[PDB]
């Protein structure tokens, strides 16, 4: 059981705290990094703090609900994972949750508006609210994540607000490190494969030709942890794109050739498409978003001036290699 996490043993952090990873790196060992992951119950967060607590970094987990917080205890030893509740609203809870954190990330992004939160709330406002306290506490290695196609421009209010949040993270505590991953695929992803696994309709616009290169989620998590600890990451925008660009027809045919089923196809245009998604907001379980409509006409706008996987010595995998595994139990 070795530290494949770190480069070394003894690390002073940027803020000047001394960290000595005693023991041999396993679950019982201690590394010393006090980390905080906002929104860790989310799909990226589980795989993230799994590898983050695999080497015994103390992970402060803020949660929102008391039920989904429980299945992240198993990836840490005693004192490794800890839990505390908070709202995005109450600033004192933000203030409290990051007091001893060496490092901290925020994967807070919600693809639909609630009746209590919009995109302007949870992307540009709350990120300001938390990284203000990061600036107040001189917390080292602050990482912010935004999505792909995070512009200043209109047509997706989500994507309109993601770049606003990026500019706010560049504004205050200005050395903050920004990462933009690709679309993601994993076992039970949010809307990209399990929506394509079972679907009574399978309708969307564009005639299925928006382009991107999806990344396996565990590669994003390993990439993030390899970011987390070294130098040469500070204040650098990070495009994290898969090995080869796809189209939706290519993706869905690759899914259906392993399912050996007729995945349905409707592909009706935008007008009748919008008003059906309008009525789904009143339902408490999450449905396809009326602003997810807009991103279907959008595609992967890659910034060339960023730093890839091969910056940090990693090669992610290709989706055709994984297609038998992930939608295996729907056979």
């Amino acid at each position: 059981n070795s530290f494949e996490n770190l480069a070394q043993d003894v690390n002073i952090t940027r803020s000047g705290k001394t960290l000595i990873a005693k023991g041999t790196g396993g679950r019982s060992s201690r590394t010393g990094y006090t980390a905080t992951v906002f929104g860790a119950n989310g799909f990226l967060g589980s795989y993230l703090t799994a590898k983050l607590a695999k080497h015994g970094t103390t992970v402060v987990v803020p949660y929102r609900e008391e039920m989904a917080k429980r299945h992240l205890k198993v990836t840490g030893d005693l004192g490794v994972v800890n839990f505390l509740e908070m709202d995005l609203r109450n600033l004192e809870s933000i203030d409290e949750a990051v007091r001893h954190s060496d490092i901290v990330v925020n994967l807070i992004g919600r693809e639909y508006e609630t009746k209590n939160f919009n995109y302007y709330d949870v992307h540009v406002e709350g990120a300001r609210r938390i990284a203000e306290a990061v600036k107040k506490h001189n917390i080292a290695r602050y990482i912010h994540v935004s999505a792909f196609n995070a512009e200043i421009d209109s047509p997706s209010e989500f994507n309109h607000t993601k770049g606003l949040g990026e500019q706010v993270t560049k504004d205050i505590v200005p050395w903050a490190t920004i990462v933009r991953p690709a679309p993601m695929f994993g076992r039970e992803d949010k809307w990209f494969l399990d929506r394509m696994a079972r679907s009574p309709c399978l309708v969307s616009a564009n005639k299925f030709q928006e382009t991107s290169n999806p990344v396996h989620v565990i590669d994003v998590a390993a990439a993030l942890e390899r970011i987390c600890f070294d130098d040469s990451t500070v204040a650098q925008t990070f495009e994290l794109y898969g090995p080869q660009k796809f189209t939706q027809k290519q993706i869905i045919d690759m899914v259906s050739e392993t399912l050996r089923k007729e995945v349905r196809h409707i592909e009706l245009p935008k007008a009748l498409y919008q008003a059906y998604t309008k009525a789904t907001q009143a339902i408490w379980w999450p449905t396809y978003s009326p602003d997810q409509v807009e991103r279907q006409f959008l595609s992967q706008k890659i910034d060339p001036s960023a730093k890839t996987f091969n910056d940090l010595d990693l090669t992610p995998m290709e989706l055709p290699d994984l297609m038998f595994k992930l939608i295996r139990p729907y056979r």
């Binding site: 000047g16 006090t34 007091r99």
Partner: protein, 117 residues
């Protein structure tokens, strides 16, 4: 009160809990690890938690010091600490104390100090 959390950030607990005891503020061991070291160690699992409902177990070094120093008529004292109500064998075992030197002498189990007079 405000102690440095290894980063220049200060953590702020009330003076009712910068205490070794409700009876004593100061440490009594070479490796006692005062509470000012302890919150400095892991406040990580102390946030969002009450400060009142931890033990604070009424440390003994203050309680033993205000017991009256007894007197012994002869030379050699005996200490048991056993009650005379309890039907059994309690207290510390029957060791004896020489009290000859100037000053009292604590029985090394019970801590009661005896004096020859």
């Amino acid at each position: 009160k405000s102690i440095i959390s290894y980063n220049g950030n200060t953590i702020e607990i009330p003076e009712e809990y910068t205490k070794q005891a409700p009876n004593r503020d100061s440490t009594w061991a070479p490796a006692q690890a005062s509470k000012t070291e302890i919150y400095k160690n892991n406040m990580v699992r102390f946030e969002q938690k009450d400060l009142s409902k931890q033990p604070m177990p009424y440390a003994g070094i203050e309680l033993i010091a205000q017991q009256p120093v007894r007197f012994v008529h002869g030379n050699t004292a005996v200490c048991d600490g056993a009650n005379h109500n309890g039907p059994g064998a309690q207290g510390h075992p029957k060791i004896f104390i020489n009290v000859d030197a100037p000053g009292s002498h604590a029985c090394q189990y019970c801590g009661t100090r005896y004096e020859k007079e």
